[PDB]
Paper text:
The crystal structure of MseMerA was solved to 1.6 Å, with R and Rfree values of 16.9 and 19.6%, respectively. Bound FAD was observed, suggesting that these molecules act to stabilize the structure. As expected based on the sequence alignment, a clear reduction in loop regions was observed in comparison to Tn501MerA. No electron density for the carboxy terminus of MseMerA was identified from 440 to 448, including the conserved pair of cysteines at residues 446 and 447. This is in agreement with the carboxy terminus being able to undergo conformational changes during the catalytic cycle. With this architecture, the active site cleft on one monomer interacts with the C-terminal domain of the opposing monomer.
The reaction catalyzed by MerA follows the reaction scheme of NADPH + Hg2+ → NADP+ + Hg0. Here, we report biochemical and structural characterization of a thermostable MerA from the aerobic thermoacidophilic Crenarchaeon Mse (MseMerA).
Numbering used by the authors:
A (entry chain A), B (entry chain A): -3 to 440
Write the structure that this text describes.
Amino acid sequence: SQDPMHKLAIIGYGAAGFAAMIKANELGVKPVLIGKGEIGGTCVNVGCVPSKRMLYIAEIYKKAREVTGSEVYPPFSSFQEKDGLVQEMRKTKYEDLLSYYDVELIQGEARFISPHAVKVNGQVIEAEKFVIATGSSPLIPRIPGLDKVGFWTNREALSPDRRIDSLAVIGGRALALEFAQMYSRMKVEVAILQRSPVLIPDWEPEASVEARRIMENDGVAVVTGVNVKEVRKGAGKIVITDKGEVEADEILLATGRKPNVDLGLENAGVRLNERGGIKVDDELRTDNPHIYAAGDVLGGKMLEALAGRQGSIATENALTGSHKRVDENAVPQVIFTQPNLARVGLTEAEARAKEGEVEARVLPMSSVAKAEIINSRLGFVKMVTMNGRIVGVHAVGENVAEMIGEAALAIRFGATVHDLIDTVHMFPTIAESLRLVALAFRSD
Amino acid sequence: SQDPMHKLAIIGYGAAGFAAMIKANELGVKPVLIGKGEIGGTCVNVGCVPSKRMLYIAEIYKKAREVTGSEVYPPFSSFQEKDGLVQEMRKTKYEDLLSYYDVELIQGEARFISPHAVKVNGQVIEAEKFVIATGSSPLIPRIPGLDKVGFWTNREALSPDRRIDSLAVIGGRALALEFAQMYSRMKVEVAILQRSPVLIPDWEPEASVEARRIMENDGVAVVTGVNVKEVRKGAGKIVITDKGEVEADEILLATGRKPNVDLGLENAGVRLNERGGIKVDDELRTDNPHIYAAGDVLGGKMLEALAGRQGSIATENALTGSHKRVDENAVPQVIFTQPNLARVGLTEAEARAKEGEVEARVLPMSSVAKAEIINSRLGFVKMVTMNGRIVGVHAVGENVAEMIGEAALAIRFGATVHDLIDTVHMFPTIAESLRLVALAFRSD
Ligand SMILES: Cc1cc2nc3c(=O)[nH]c(=O)nc-3n(C[C@H](O)[C@H](O)[C@H](O)COP(=O)(O)OP(=O)(O)OC[C@H]3O[C@@H](n4cnc5c(N)ncnc54)[C@H](O)[C@@H]3O)c2cc1C
Ligand SMILES: Cc1cc2nc3c(=O)[nH]c(=O)nc-3n(C[C@H](O)[C@H](O)[C@H](O)COP(=O)(O)OP(=O)(O)OC[C@H]3O[C@@H](n4cnc5c(N)ncnc54)[C@H](O)[C@@H]3O)c2cc1C
């Protein structure tokens, strides 16, 4: 028999799929790239780019109100203005690359029909190797009355159909925090309804404390330990919980994301992991050794830079036979509230659960000169070492997102606290808090 | 003979001298610490702390005017308000340490009278070892009429005696840029008069370009290639130059700093270097092997974090017999205008002047997603490698001061561009510009 096949097919054209496409070109292969929906996927269109833009607008108006005492809020039109930036970035960063790089693009929904083939738009596409990069979708909880009453997800909260006065946010991790701060800074009365007893319960305890303070400082009502029983429609929307009824103009779901795995995977011998994403080994290879997967479809951390890195590594492993990995314990995550929350590596509890000598220190941000100078004293920097190497850094403070890459690099290099002590920082910066917390390991 | 002496005397109680005092305590020695003037020296009192505070105030009001369209400038009282922060920081960071650590403090002017002794307040103080950390003072150029007409230095520009409408700044390096932006953002008409053909002429060429644009964007008149011949008094102060007369309410000298070396050094066998600072080897030891020196008195880079590090290293080398050094080519410098200018390591020209394979790349800030998102597209990131190791990073952009410590750490570790490529950053941050410029080494 002979069965000529493409060398590589990539399923999905978001951050992971683009990274795969680029890598494939670099290794001398013209891939087939199959996607549906807006080019560039979640990040550029309904994710990191429009969300950070609206938080920037929120921030500059908040500062303007503090300085002037005026009640100036961002105009409702600022949501529509941001659509110009999205369009420009989608063009320059994604659409223009489809002209520059070599690729057979197909727009449509792919589903596996064999271990070496998909169907799309009724046609068979066969490939020697696949990279699955189909992303995630909003997770819609099963709550009586919710579908009938209707709700917003991120998509709608970024392009709102109307001006609202009140918002009930269901959920209490990063996206809830970001949208709650965003809408509260637009003169919307926001409540967060969180099931766990604290916000961001998989972060350091100190971070969960600060998360509450950040929200409350902008007038958000934070309700923790709550179970939502039902939703109904009154004058506005009524969320009925075991701690009372919360009425609001609109409901925003921020209860997580579900990997996009409705792909006929059983036809290709690909399995799901316990988190509902594609099951892969550390080299991003599935149970079918010709199929790799990358990005949010893995059901792991959901980050643009990690999705990109995984799309590159999956592609190289598929086309070269390499055995490359991307160490998730040096990958940073940031919540882009003001002040920022940032983390990379292990929490102290995670480190203490492994074998090894663990130390940890926490430096208050109120001790950092620059934080005093710019009136941003809320926060902290926490550093965790295992056998004398830095393995985790967690921080809350002004623009800590800008210093977390120093911490990531320190962790990749296995830097010790003396290594940081020996590195002259710039005074006065927020970043020199990394060296000040290192000094805390022996010094006061 | 017997001549009992103290183990260590430290001359000057700024950043270097404090660092020495602390280090001495850590090695089990109670030093004698001799200083004059305000405790904490330049940084806290008339340097980095009050200057960054006033630039912060300038910045938040500028943003408030952009957002509201109102003509709100910082009140003249904000200079006096900053004196509270200075006092608080002087107490917590310096005066309180004199109670916590063990030290014999003497306030007065020290001068050497022998290789092992100083005089202060008419008393002989003998020590086995000395660390000289006497700082620098403003450099006052010899210009006819200038002393009679009078001028401001940093001290006066930070605590102005009156409200002015116009300012002539003599000089064109970091402090000129910072004060020019500061006063222009206080509705003062500022002119910079610079002798060299460009601003900051020891920075990368790209930085000098950007420096001019930054100044001009706030309405500063930048005059380069000018020689100041004379000053006279008219209605206001008249600076006569070979390119015309510039009249202003006040004159600010920003023409550099002179090390404080009027110390009787010839009595102790200590010599001066070609830049007018104390001559030392890389271990901070002078020609008298019992005398070390640290900080701005060396006539090298003038930075708080470097002065601290040198005071620690000088002390350890003096008391333990070690041979430690502080590598100046991993020490960062930042100009805290908005946007910031930052640098660490070698310029491209400096690297190309040494033997080795040199590469360099420049990434525009307009290519960085976060810079687009926050409307701060002016700038660049330049990376220089020598034999495949990163040896210099230079950047202009919003809050680049916060990412320059990542670059410093990369340089200390001898990181390659692949090392940066392999480190997942956070999207969207300004800091991921370090990885984007690394990608430029092979990729477009
Ligand atoms: C509101 C919001 C804000 C965020 N902010 C940040 C942030 O600040 N920083 C950060 O790092 N991360 C952020 N994220 C997460 C980040 O956007 C994602 O982790 C990232 O987009 C992952 O990209 P991906 O390619 O793995 O998934 P996607 O980009 O969703 O890739 C899937 C793409 O493939 C196509 N596709 C899907 N299924 C199929 C199929 N069956 N057949 C054919 N084609 C298909 C779709 O068209 C889709 O565009 C945010 C997410 C959200 C929702
Ligand atoms: C306006 C301005 C802004 C600045 N901003 C920054 C910045 O943002 N970041 C940064 O890194 N750097 C900055 N600097 C530079 C920084 O302040 C100095 O490099 C730093 O203070 C050096 O400290 P030092 O201890 O070496 O000198 P000093 O702190 O001046 O130490 C000298 C001290 O010793 C005492 N002394 C001096 N001579 C004698 C003597 N003969 N006998 C006895 N005692 C003596 C004096 O009382 C003096 O306080 C700035 C400088 C200025 C002027």
